[PDB]
Amino acid sequence: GRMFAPTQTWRRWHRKIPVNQKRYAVASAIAASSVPSLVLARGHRIESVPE
Amino acid sequence: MKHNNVIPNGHFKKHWQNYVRTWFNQPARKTRRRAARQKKAATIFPRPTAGSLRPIVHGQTLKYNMKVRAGRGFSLEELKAAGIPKKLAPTIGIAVDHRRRNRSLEGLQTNVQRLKTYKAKLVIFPRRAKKVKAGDSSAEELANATQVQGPYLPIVRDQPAIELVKITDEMKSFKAYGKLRIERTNARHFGARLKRAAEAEKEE
Amino acid sequence: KQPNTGISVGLNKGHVVTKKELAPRPSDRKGKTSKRIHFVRSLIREVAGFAPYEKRITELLKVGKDKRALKVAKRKLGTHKRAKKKREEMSSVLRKMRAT
Amino acid sequence: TTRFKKNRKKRGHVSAGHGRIGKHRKHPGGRGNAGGMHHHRILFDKYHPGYFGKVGMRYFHKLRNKFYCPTVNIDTLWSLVPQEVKDKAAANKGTAPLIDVTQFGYFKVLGKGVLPTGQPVVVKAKLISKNAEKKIKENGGAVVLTA
RNA sequence: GCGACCCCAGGUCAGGCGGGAUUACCCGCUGAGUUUAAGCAUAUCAAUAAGCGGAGGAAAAGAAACUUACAAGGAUUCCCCUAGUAACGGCGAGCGAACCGGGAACAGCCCAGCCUUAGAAUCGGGCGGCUCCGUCGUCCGAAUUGUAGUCUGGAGAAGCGUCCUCAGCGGCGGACCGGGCCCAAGUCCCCUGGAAGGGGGCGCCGGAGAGGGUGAGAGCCCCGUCGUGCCCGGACCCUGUCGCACCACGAGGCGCUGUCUACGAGUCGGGUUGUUUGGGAAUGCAGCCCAAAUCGGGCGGUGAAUUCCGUCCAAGGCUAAAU
RNA sequence: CCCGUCUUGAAACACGGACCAAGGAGUCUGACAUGUGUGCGAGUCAACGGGCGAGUAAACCCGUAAGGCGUAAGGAAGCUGAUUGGUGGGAUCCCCCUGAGGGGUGCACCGCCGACCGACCUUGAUCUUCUGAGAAGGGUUCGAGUGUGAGCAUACCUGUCG
RNA sequence: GUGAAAGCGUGGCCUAACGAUCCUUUAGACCUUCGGAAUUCGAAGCUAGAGGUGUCAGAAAAGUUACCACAGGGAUAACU
Ligand SMILES: [K+]
Ligand SMILES: [K+]
Ligand SMILES: [K+]
Ligand SMILES: [K+]
Ligand SMILES: [K+]
Ligand SMILES: [K+]
Ligand SMILES: [K+]
Ligand SMILES: [K+]
Ligand SMILES: [K+]
Ligand SMILES: [K+]
Ligand SMILES: [K+]
Ligand SMILES: [K+]
Ligand SMILES: [K+]
Ligand SMILES: [K+]
Ligand SMILES: [K+]
Ligand SMILES: [Mg+2]
Ligand SMILES: [Mg+2]
Ligand SMILES: [Mg+2]
Ligand SMILES: [Mg+2]
Ligand SMILES: [Mg+2]
Ligand SMILES: [Mg+2]
Ligand SMILES: [Mg+2]
Ligand SMILES: [Mg+2]
Ligand SMILES: [Mg+2]
Ligand SMILES: [Mg+2]
Ligand SMILES: [Mg+2]
Ligand SMILES: [Mg+2]
Ligand SMILES: [Mg+2]
Ligand SMILES: [Mg+2]
Ligand SMILES: [Mg+2]
Ligand SMILES: [Mg+2]
Ligand SMILES: [Mg+2]
Ligand SMILES: [Mg+2]
Ligand SMILES: [Mg+2]
Ligand SMILES: [Mg+2]
Ligand SMILES: [Mg+2]
Ligand SMILES: [Mg+2]
Ligand SMILES: [Mg+2]
Ligand SMILES: [Mg+2]
Ligand SMILES: [Mg+2]
Ligand SMILES: [Mg+2]
Ligand SMILES: [Mg+2]
Ligand SMILES: [Mg+2]
Ligand SMILES: [Mg+2]
Ligand SMILES: [Mg+2]
Ligand SMILES: [Mg+2]
Ligand SMILES: [Mg+2]
Ligand SMILES: [Mg+2]
Ligand SMILES: [Mg+2]
Ligand SMILES: [Mg+2]
Ligand SMILES: [Mg+2]
Ligand SMILES: [Mg+2]
Ligand SMILES: [Mg+2]
Ligand SMILES: [Mg+2]
Ligand SMILES: [Mg+2]
Ligand SMILES: [Mg+2]
Ligand SMILES: [Mg+2]
Ligand SMILES: [Mg+2]
Ligand SMILES: [Mg+2]
Ligand SMILES: [Mg+2]
Ligand SMILES: [Mg+2]
Ligand SMILES: [Mg+2]
Ligand SMILES: [Mg+2]
Ligand SMILES: [Mg+2]
Ligand SMILES: [Mg+2]
Ligand SMILES: [Mg+2]
Ligand SMILES: [Mg+2]
């Protein structure tokens, strides 16, 4: 038979976050990369990194 | 239908699902148009990639008459004032519009200067290699004969800076609101006043 | 058609600008034909004559029923503008016919 | 987001939250705006007064550009001047800045609020209210008309 | 009776053209109801499905009888916006465009009519030759009830002088599209196992750690993958360069000139009927009736007369791109 | 006493169900609304498109008088267009005093009453181009108004509708 | 209006005696609009009434079926 509520191509796949929020997220990510505790917490092995 | 809500007016009673226009090809369309422009630029080299020169025209209606934009082509009167025959203009990158009228001197003069500026920085290669004819350049076909990308005579706004004037007693006594009301009143009574004046002549 | 006063309201309102007459155009003489065309149409009128309803119009004009002649013309041609132009044409034909 | 939809919380509860008595039938009150005058009368009158009927004159082929008339109030007029020009205004009291509102996409000047104290301004606009003109004049300014 | 022309007939006469198929998109016609309105007839579903035709890689549309009322825009198409707006609607249910503005693309043109009359200057066919998508010669036809030139309203004809512009092919290369060929590094030692492609150890390639195959998780066993190099072909378009040729008679451009200055009819328009449209004293279309004009005609979203003003030039035709 | 179900009432002499496996039903989308999270804020939004770019359907950049919504309302319309708060309670803080105390402070919110803009009505010294201007002065009228902005984008639940 | 006057009178001594949208029609305002600019007809608006919906919060509406159909109802008849 036919499935319930057949999936359609015109589902709303994409999302447009405001540009300023996207810039906010990038800045936070850049700042977090300079914190060794956060870099280690994410699973990176930076035990021998000079700085 | 229940509760306090705006009255719905969804136009979804036809077979709309058969007329849905998706935009999943939007990135592909951008790619194809960029490829077309890139291919076109090489075909017309060294002619500028911006295309033909367009005139400056005012926006239409009261809402947009304060701005200017690119029009279709220079009018025949503008071309004649600039001394460019209409049959030669399209062959040297000048758009021609035989329909456009010229109701004012300011509009005519603005585009005439635009044509003269364009001719100043226009290099024309000879039709045949060796012999050089009228209108062609000499020794400039190699110096600065490069394809210009982007606009070369942009049509842009030039907003004037705030000017500080001296307030005279004449301006302080001017009644702006009174002027507007009087002008409005004279406009909507123009027909009636002209009627009685004509009727007075018949009696007299 | 005076120059604009520079005010946004009132008679002759609008932005101040130096108005100039539009350049002459070939289409300005639209509706005018050559002398030959007038000659050809005049000759064909002699050969063809007048239509039955045109004969009715001129008969009314002979008896002085100008008002009825126009109404007949409007019913036939359709518009008042064409009807009164047609009536004047019939009057011109009759005016120079009675003088011969 | 499917996992947050409350239907998931209702799995195994038979009626899906629509009741055993009333049930969830197709259109038990008609579709859309059906029965606005008959069985949804109270709803329309209580929340949508004025819905039914006709008022006013028609306007065939009404174009909105003819009616374009953006307005700016007195209190907002000073904010149009650039900051560098504001300093000049306070540096020389002999002259006054010329604020042409049309250059900022405004046609008419209304008279809400007050102007900066001790600062004459020459306002250039297509239209102006009488209160706006009075406030400009009493502050030492003047009004110029354009189009 | 013999001839010319006219109309028509026959021909297995010489040489051509047409039918049918396909369905995604495209063009024309025809045309419902379920349904919604909590009933139902106008309406809505829908100018849709079904039905009948016709095309192409696109089709259709297209160089204003336009938008507008502004300081004015300027073929068509398409996107955003205009806007769920003006409007339409048992003014109920519902329905619903357009201009401005911002962008994609961009391209303009050909005829009909007065104008060779010291020359039908035009075209087809048969036959022959050549440098063969054509061209030349010759013959027989078409055509004066008009072929070719000139002209298309943006103009133009004619006269005058400024003395500005205009005449081909070939060689090579690039660009474009398609294909073919070679080219990195372990299968080293131990253990388990039917099999190592697994674990441990020791190495290597990497502009190649995409993917697949091979007896289990394989960059280095195999095909490939990355990046060069080499070779072959298709388009004849675009473009660079070289060689040869390069008659301005004529035509065009520019300037002036008294004068001339031709533009589509049972069509426009009107009445009426039906249908359709957001179009409302009537948006388009169609039938029937009436039936134009040339200092004129159409449009200017309320019918009518009167005075102005703005605007364009229908009733013939072709045309790439954005979709 | 047999589960499921409609029911005032089911163990019912009400209906479905012999048994097992697997499949099997509030979803997607448009509009709007309240709430909440986030960004910015009298602004906000990179949305058509362009510039590019992980050799790239992503990400990044671009709004120059673009546009949407908001920034001003009332009126059928012609049109006109906010003179810019008083008071009773009240959070917090400050001082005195150590009381169910007394002063100063008075945000948010609520009640009450003016003023201002507009429809309607009313009013008119003094001027004017004769129909407009407006000194003063209004109203048991009406408004989805004003009296120092709160919106815009976005995510999701719930609800109405197609 | 009435009474000398206080006062009374916004229909009937009090408790019933009546009617939306759209459309039409009338009355009123030297009123507004017909959107290129005017004049006069015509038309369209604003304010208050009238023409009616008695199923009276207001669709425009005759039968038959023993030839019958479907969704249901033990919310409801014809047995125990
Ligand atoms: K698409
Ligand atoms: K529920
Ligand atoms: K031949
Ligand atoms: K492998
Ligand atoms: K012609
Ligand atoms: K019609
Ligand atoms: K005309
Ligand atoms: K049940
Ligand atoms: K039961
Ligand atoms: K049972
Ligand atoms: K709600
Ligand atoms: K904005
Ligand atoms: K931009
Ligand atoms: K009103
Ligand atoms: K009833
Ligand atoms: Mg449907
Ligand atoms: Mg443009
Ligand atoms: Mg429960
Ligand atoms: Mg249930
Ligand atoms: Mg229910
Ligand atoms: Mg539902
Ligand atoms: Mg044969
Ligand atoms: Mg129904
Ligand atoms: Mg139903
Ligand atoms: Mg039915
Ligand atoms: Mg079909
Ligand atoms: Mg076919
Ligand atoms: Mg084909
Ligand atoms: Mg294409
Ligand atoms: Mg075509
Ligand atoms: Mg033309
Ligand atoms: Mg156009
Ligand atoms: Mg909107
Ligand atoms: Mg429709
Ligand atoms: Mg369009
Ligand atoms: Mg446009
Ligand atoms: Mg000829
Ligand atoms: Mg010539
Ligand atoms: Mg000539
Ligand atoms: Mg190893
Ligand atoms: Mg195995
Ligand atoms: Mg290998
Ligand atoms: Mg390669
Ligand atoms: Mg024509
Ligand atoms: Mg007709
Ligand atoms: Mg039809
Ligand atoms: Mg065509
Ligand atoms: Mg029971
Ligand atoms: Mg039970
Ligand atoms: Mg029992
Ligand atoms: Mg049952
Ligand atoms: Mg059973
Ligand atoms: Mg299962
Ligand atoms: Mg929110
Ligand atoms: Mg804007
Ligand atoms: Mg008013
Ligand atoms: Mg007031
Ligand atoms: Mg008395
Ligand atoms: Mg009574
Ligand atoms: Mg009595
Ligand atoms: Mg009484
Ligand atoms: Mg009544
Ligand atoms: Mg009425
Ligand atoms: Mg009009
Ligand atoms: Mg009732
Ligand atoms: Mg029956
Ligand atoms: Mg019972």
XYZ file of N, CA and C (backbone and C1' of nucleotides) in Angstrom, chain B residues 8-15 19 21 23 29 32-33 37 40 43 54 56-62 64-67 69-72 76 80 85-87 96-101 103-104 127-128 130-131 133-134, chain E residues 36 45-48 63-64 66-75 79-80 84 93-96 100-102 104-108 154-155 164-167 238-239 242-243 246 252-255 310-312 322-323:
520
model
N -8.654 32.823 8.761
C -7.742 32.214 7.787
C -8.205 32.450 6.359
N -7.233 32.611 5.462
C -7.506 32.785 4.038
C -6.506 31.998 3.198
N -6.212 30.767 3.604
C -5.267 29.952 2.856
C -5.808 29.599 1.481
N -5.022 29.890 0.443
C -5.408 29.593 -0.939
C -4.864 28.218 -1.337
N -5.394 27.188 -0.684
C -4.940 25.817 -0.896
C -6.117 24.890 -1.163
N -7.060 25.339 -1.989
C -8.217 24.534 -2.356
C -8.110 23.930 -3.752
N -7.126 24.342 -4.548
C -6.897 23.763 -5.863
C -5.913 22.598 -5.739
N -5.416 22.111 -6.876
C -4.391 21.064 -6.896
C -2.996 21.689 -6.824
N 1.807 22.171 -8.559
C 2.385 23.420 -9.042
C 3.377 23.996 -8.039
N 7.001 24.912 -6.881
C 8.286 25.221 -7.498
C 9.354 25.165 -6.412
N 13.455 24.969 -5.132
C 14.637 25.763 -5.447
C 15.917 24.993 -5.146
N 21.968 26.934 -10.550
C 21.700 28.080 -11.413
C 22.792 29.133 -11.274
N 25.735 27.889 -13.285
C 25.555 27.970 -14.732
C 25.657 29.408 -15.227
N 25.047 30.351 -14.506
C 25.106 31.748 -14.927
C 26.525 32.296 -14.835
N 28.681 33.835 -17.952
C 29.364 35.125 -17.935
C 30.855 34.965 -18.208
N 31.242 34.316 -21.831
C 30.956 35.519 -22.606
C 32.120 36.501 -22.555
N 34.722 35.664 -25.065
C 34.281 35.868 -26.441
C 34.440 37.323 -26.867
N 25.008 52.385 -20.639
C 23.607 52.708 -20.432
C 23.461 54.148 -19.947
N 21.636 57.508 -17.896
C 21.089 57.806 -16.578
C 19.650 58.264 -16.760
N 18.729 57.634 -16.035
C 17.315 57.965 -16.122
C 16.744 58.086 -14.717
N 15.672 58.864 -14.599
C 14.997 59.035 -13.323
C 14.033 57.884 -13.069
N 13.787 57.614 -11.791
C 12.750 56.671 -11.432
C 11.370 57.222 -11.741
N 10.433 56.315 -11.984
C 9.092 56.696 -12.398
C 8.192 56.915 -11.187
N 7.164 57.742 -11.383
C 6.171 58.038 -10.358
C 6.742 58.946 -9.275
N 5.866 59.452 -8.406
C 6.284 60.348 -7.335
C 7.156 59.650 -6.300
N 9.654 57.447 -6.715
C 11.035 57.160 -7.090
C 11.640 58.233 -7.990
N 11.029 59.413 -8.081
C 11.561 60.439 -8.970
C 12.787 61.142 -8.402
N 13.156 60.872 -7.151
C 14.331 61.489 -6.551
C 15.618 60.722 -6.825
N 15.537 59.522 -7.390
C 16.707 58.696 -7.648
C 16.925 58.535 -9.146
N 18.808 55.773 -12.200
C 19.181 54.396 -12.475
C 19.606 54.287 -13.930
N 20.083 53.103 -14.297
C 20.453 52.826 -15.677
C 19.200 52.621 -16.519
N 19.163 53.265 -17.686
C 18.089 53.088 -18.636
C 18.441 52.073 -19.709
N 17.597 52.029 -20.741
C 17.808 51.079 -21.828
C 18.910 51.551 -22.772
N 17.996 59.356 -29.423
C 18.555 59.869 -30.668
C 19.001 61.317 -30.512
N 22.850 62.717 -31.145
C 23.150 63.797 -32.078
C 23.878 64.939 -31.380
N 26.833 59.247 -34.690
C 25.727 58.751 -35.517
C 25.088 57.517 -34.896
N 23.762 57.426 -35.028
C 23.022 56.375 -34.337
C 23.402 54.987 -34.838
N 23.768 54.863 -36.114
C 24.139 53.558 -36.648
C 25.511 53.103 -36.172
N 21.369 52.137 -27.689
C 20.544 53.124 -28.377
C 19.081 52.789 -28.120
N 18.307 53.798 -27.724
C 16.873 53.656 -27.481
C 16.162 54.737 -28.289
N 15.565 54.346 -29.416
C 14.896 55.301 -30.289
C 13.535 55.738 -29.763
N 13.044 55.132 -28.684
C 11.739 55.488 -28.142
C 11.804 56.595 -27.099
N 12.924 56.738 -26.395
C 12.972 57.640 -25.252
C 12.932 59.095 -25.700
N 12.083 59.880 -25.044
C 11.956 61.305 -25.298
C 12.848 62.092 -24.340
N 12.241 65.484 -22.276
C 11.339 66.553 -21.865
C 12.048 67.722 -21.194
N 13.313 67.570 -20.808
C 14.010 68.602 -20.056
C 15.444 68.724 -20.549
N 39.616 48.174 -38.194
C 38.953 47.008 -38.770
C 39.963 46.058 -39.398
N 40.963 46.599 -40.087
C 42.038 45.815 -40.674
C 43.363 46.200 -40.027
N 46.775 46.846 -40.771
C 47.759 47.895 -41.026
C 47.104 49.263 -41.189
N 46.238 49.412 -42.189
C 45.672 50.722 -42.484
C 44.774 51.192 -41.346
N 41.961 54.027 -40.014
C 40.894 54.888 -40.500
C 40.449 55.842 -39.396
N 39.512 56.720 -39.745
C 39.031 57.717 -38.798
C 38.352 57.048 -37.610
P -17.656 18.478 0.889
O -17.307 20.025 0.791
C -15.992 20.492 1.044
C -15.925 21.995 0.973
C -17.131 22.738 1.528
O -17.130 22.844 2.941
C -16.582 23.623 -0.581
P -11.921 27.637 -7.780
O -11.851 26.046 -7.759
C -11.371 25.349 -6.619
C -11.793 23.903 -6.639
C -11.448 23.120 -7.899
O -10.113 22.645 -7.898
C -13.706 22.724 -7.311
P -9.265 22.555 -9.260
O -9.285 24.039 -9.833
C -8.479 24.399 -10.948
C -9.261 25.160 -11.992
C -10.039 26.374 -11.476
O -10.011 27.408 -12.455
C -11.515 24.906 -12.563
P -9.291 28.807 -12.149
O -8.882 29.331 -13.595
C -8.287 28.456 -14.539
C -9.307 27.900 -15.502
C -8.741 27.327 -16.797
O -8.346 25.974 -16.644
C -10.533 28.809 -17.286
C -8.468 22.139 -13.836
C -6.722 21.636 -15.342
C -6.472 23.003 -14.718
O -5.526 20.922 -15.602
C -6.126 24.117 -15.676
O -6.827 23.986 -16.905
P -7.358 25.265 -17.695
P 6.318 43.282 -31.246
O 6.593 44.843 -31.401
C 7.657 45.327 -32.217
C 8.623 46.184 -31.436
C 9.550 47.046 -32.291
O 9.844 48.272 -31.620
C 10.842 45.558 -30.994
P 8.820 49.507 -31.690
O 7.587 49.022 -30.810
C 6.251 49.382 -31.139
C 5.265 48.723 -30.207
C 3.867 49.330 -30.199
O 2.906 48.313 -29.917
C 4.817 49.535 -28.051
P -1.155 51.752 -26.978
O -0.367 51.182 -25.715
C -0.370 49.794 -25.418
C 0.682 49.435 -24.397
C 0.622 50.181 -23.074
O -0.356 49.679 -22.185
C 2.841 50.179 -23.855
P -1.026 50.647 -21.094
O 0.159 50.974 -20.080
C 0.693 49.959 -19.244
C 1.908 50.433 -18.484
C 1.684 51.526 -17.450
O 1.149 51.045 -16.229
C 3.571 52.062 -18.755
C 2.255 56.342 -16.604
C 1.659 56.208 -14.317
C 2.214 54.872 -14.781
O 1.997 56.510 -12.974
C 1.433 53.647 -14.376
O 0.452 53.313 -15.345
P -0.067 51.816 -15.512
P 1.011 57.396 -12.066
O 1.145 58.865 -12.664
C 2.387 59.561 -12.643
C 2.240 60.965 -13.175
C 1.245 61.841 -12.416
O 1.686 63.197 -12.421
C 0.537 61.608 -14.659
P 2.161 63.905 -11.059
O 3.751 63.835 -11.128
C 4.496 63.121 -10.154
C 5.824 62.668 -10.702
C 6.554 63.669 -11.584
O 7.278 64.622 -10.826
C 6.558 61.530 -12.616
P 7.536 66.102 -11.394
O 8.812 65.928 -12.327
C 9.364 67.032 -13.036
C 10.748 66.715 -13.546
C 10.915 65.307 -14.107
O 11.863 65.324 -15.172
C 12.350 65.589 -12.249
P 11.378 65.662 -16.664
O 10.503 64.398 -17.069
C 11.123 63.194 -17.484
C 10.811 62.054 -16.550
C 11.152 60.673 -17.085
O 12.506 60.336 -16.845
C 8.936 60.676 -16.241
P 13.345 59.468 -17.902
O 13.212 57.981 -17.350
C 13.214 56.863 -18.224
C 12.319 55.771 -17.701
C 12.249 54.510 -18.552
O 13.272 53.592 -18.206
C 10.054 55.249 -18.006
P 14.161 52.870 -19.331
O 13.098 52.336 -20.383
C 12.231 51.246 -20.083
C 11.414 50.875 -21.291
C 12.239 50.527 -22.523
O 11.507 49.633 -23.357
C 10.996 52.482 -22.951
P 11.562 48.047 -23.117
O 11.251 47.451 -24.558
C 10.089 47.846 -25.271
C 9.570 46.724 -26.129
C 9.258 45.432 -25.391
O 7.995 45.437 -24.752
C 10.587 44.940 -27.265
P 8.788 33.744 -12.751
O 9.960 34.168 -11.761
C 10.921 33.225 -11.316
C 11.944 33.869 -10.415
C 11.389 34.720 -9.283
O 10.954 33.962 -8.169
C 13.098 35.912 -10.379
P 9.685 34.446 -7.313
O 10.242 35.666 -6.457
C 11.288 35.480 -5.516
C 11.764 36.791 -4.945
C 10.687 37.709 -4.391
O 10.236 37.339 -3.100
C 12.165 38.961 -5.739
P 1.112 40.595 2.201
O -0.341 40.005 2.467
C -0.818 38.891 1.723
C -1.935 39.284 0.786
C -3.324 39.351 1.412
O -4.092 40.328 0.710
C -3.318 37.714 -0.272
P -17.227 34.601 4.319
O -17.039 33.143 3.712
C -17.636 32.011 4.321
C -17.549 30.805 3.423
C -16.194 30.567 2.774
O -15.290 29.891 3.631
C -17.885 30.429 1.130
P -13.717 30.220 3.578
O -13.271 29.701 2.142
C -12.362 30.438 1.338
C -12.901 30.627 -0.057
C -11.926 31.189 -1.082
O -11.067 30.201 -1.624
C -13.976 32.359 -1.222
P -9.556 30.566 -2.027
O -9.708 31.523 -3.290
C -10.439 31.120 -4.439
C -10.712 32.290 -5.349
C -9.490 33.082 -5.789
O -8.837 32.496 -6.900
C -11.169 34.568 -5.029
P -7.241 32.587 -7.050
O -6.966 34.125 -7.350
C -7.447 34.746 -8.532
C -7.165 36.226 -8.518
C -5.746 36.623 -8.137
O -4.841 36.546 -9.221
C -7.268 37.890 -6.865
P 6.915 48.982 -14.742
O 7.185 49.928 -13.489
C 7.041 51.336 -13.587
C 7.072 51.987 -12.229
C 8.360 51.814 -11.438
O 9.364 52.740 -11.815
C 6.509 51.338 -10.047
P 10.860 52.241 -12.123
O 11.341 51.582 -10.756
C 11.525 52.366 -9.588
C 11.936 51.518 -8.410
C 13.081 50.547 -8.651
O 14.360 51.155 -8.612
C 11.330 49.421 -7.546
P 15.582 50.511 -9.434
O 15.834 49.116 -8.710
C 16.279 49.062 -7.365
C 16.613 47.652 -6.956
C 17.455 46.858 -7.941
O 18.836 47.166 -7.869
C 15.642 45.534 -7.216
P 22.074 41.303 -12.509
O 21.350 40.031 -13.138
C 21.548 38.734 -12.598
C 20.931 37.672 -13.472
C 21.238 37.773 -14.957
O 22.498 37.217 -15.298
C 18.916 37.429 -14.649
P 23.460 37.959 -16.349
O 22.644 37.922 -17.715
C 22.306 36.691 -18.336
C 21.306 36.896 -19.442
C 21.701 37.901 -20.515
O 22.557 37.351 -21.501
C 19.501 38.356 -19.791
P 23.667 38.269 -22.215
O 22.820 39.303 -23.080
C 22.020 38.859 -24.165
C 21.040 39.916 -24.607
C 21.639 41.211 -25.129
O 22.080 41.107 -26.471
C 19.884 41.702 -23.621
P 22.854 42.325 -27.177
O 21.683 43.311 -27.620
C 21.869 44.272 -28.655
C 20.595 44.481 -29.436
C 19.317 44.353 -28.610
O 18.296 45.192 -29.151
C 19.341 42.682 -30.271
P 18.450 46.790 -29.128
O 19.088 47.131 -30.547
C 18.300 47.124 -31.729
C 18.600 45.927 -32.596
C 18.255 46.077 -34.069
O 19.249 46.770 -34.802
C 17.388 44.034 -33.276
P 8.958 57.630 -35.395
O 10.545 57.547 -35.508
C 11.389 58.181 -34.553
C 12.838 57.842 -34.794
C 13.271 57.882 -36.258
O 14.624 58.322 -36.359
C 13.568 55.695 -35.408
P 14.947 59.830 -36.810
O 14.034 60.054 -38.097
C 14.536 59.828 -39.408
C 14.104 58.487 -39.942
C 14.425 58.215 -41.404
O 15.769 57.824 -41.624
C 12.183 57.637 -40.989
P 38.542 62.563 -46.058
O 37.896 61.567 -44.998
C 37.711 61.958 -43.646
C 36.591 61.187 -42.993
C 36.422 59.743 -43.440
O 37.333 58.859 -42.811
C 34.317 60.812 -43.422
P 37.969 57.632 -43.631
O 36.816 56.534 -43.635
C 36.356 55.961 -42.420
C 35.141 55.096 -42.638
C 35.288 53.988 -43.668
O 35.960 52.847 -43.165
C 33.262 55.136 -44.039
P 36.859 51.944 -44.142
O 35.793 51.090 -44.961
C 34.876 50.241 -44.291
C 33.775 49.780 -45.211
C 34.222 49.103 -46.495
O 34.583 47.747 -46.309
C 32.545 50.692 -46.986
P 35.839 47.127 -47.095
O 35.240 45.842 -47.817
C 33.921 45.855 -48.354
C 33.843 45.095 -49.653
C 34.831 43.939 -49.786
O 34.239 42.881 -50.536
C 35.218 45.507 -51.509
P 32.518 33.392 -36.531
O 33.266 33.702 -35.160
C 32.539 34.118 -34.014
C 33.371 34.009 -32.763
C 34.746 34.654 -32.820
O 34.708 36.054 -32.608
C 34.936 32.484 -31.909
P 35.652 37.030 -33.469
O 37.101 36.800 -32.849
C 37.329 36.966 -31.458
C 38.613 36.307 -31.024
C 39.856 36.688 -31.812
O 40.411 37.928 -31.408
C 39.771 34.343 -31.572
P 51.149 39.761 -37.715
O 51.487 38.770 -38.915
C 52.736 38.095 -38.969
C 52.724 36.977 -39.982
C 52.478 37.383 -41.426
O 53.634 37.897 -42.065
C 51.125 35.524 -40.895
P 53.494 39.042 -43.185
O 52.994 38.258 -44.479
C 53.839 37.323 -45.131
C 53.093 36.526 -46.172
C 52.414 37.325 -47.272
O 53.307 37.743 -48.290
C 50.918 35.695 -46.448
P 45.776 44.139 -56.069
O 44.848 44.913 -55.030
C 43.433 44.820 -55.106
C 42.769 45.414 -53.888
C 43.088 46.871 -53.596
O 42.324 47.771 -54.378
C 43.284 45.610 -51.608
P 22.345 55.470 -50.097
O 23.130 55.385 -48.713
C 22.899 54.312 -47.814
C 24.002 54.187 -46.790
C 24.166 55.354 -45.828
O 23.232 55.334 -44.762
C 26.281 54.722 -46.664
P 22.713 56.712 -44.117
O 23.994 57.304 -43.377
C 24.514 56.683 -42.211
C 25.777 57.356 -41.738
C 25.661 58.834 -41.397
O 25.122 59.063 -40.107
C 27.575 58.481 -42.738
P 24.084 60.265 -39.865
O 24.980 61.576 -39.982
C 26.010 61.837 -39.042
C 26.880 62.991 -39.475
C 26.156 64.284 -39.810
O 25.802 65.038 -38.665
C 27.723 63.805 -41.506
P 24.422 65.859 -38.636
O 24.683 67.083 -39.621
C 25.653 68.072 -39.310
C 25.794 69.084 -40.419
C 24.499 69.659 -40.972
O 23.948 70.681 -40.162
C 25.904 69.034 -42.761
P 0.397 67.939 -24.825
O 0.548 66.511 -24.139
C 1.244 66.364 -22.911
C 1.131 64.960 -22.376
C 1.590 63.853 -23.311
O 2.996 63.686 -23.323
C -0.495 63.271 -22.364
P 3.755 63.280 -24.680
O 3.296 61.778 -24.945
C 3.589 60.750 -24.011
C 2.757 59.517 -24.258
C 2.881 58.882 -25.635
O 4.039 58.074 -25.769
C 0.600 59.047 -25.047
P 5.054 58.293 -26.997
O 4.556 57.266 -28.106
C 4.758 55.870 -27.948
C 3.530 55.083 -28.329
C 3.289 54.884 -29.817
O 4.067 53.833 -30.364
C 1.280 55.565 -28.782
P 19.494 30.912 -21.936
O 18.996 31.581 -20.580
C 19.923 32.115 -19.646
C 19.328 33.268 -18.877
C 18.024 32.975 -18.149
O 18.237 32.392 -16.876
C 17.835 35.009 -19.365
P 17.865 30.855 -16.595
O 16.291 30.788 -16.815
C 15.395 31.510 -15.985
C 13.965 31.181 -16.329
C 13.618 29.699 -16.319
O 13.322 29.203 -15.026
C 12.878 30.647 -18.340
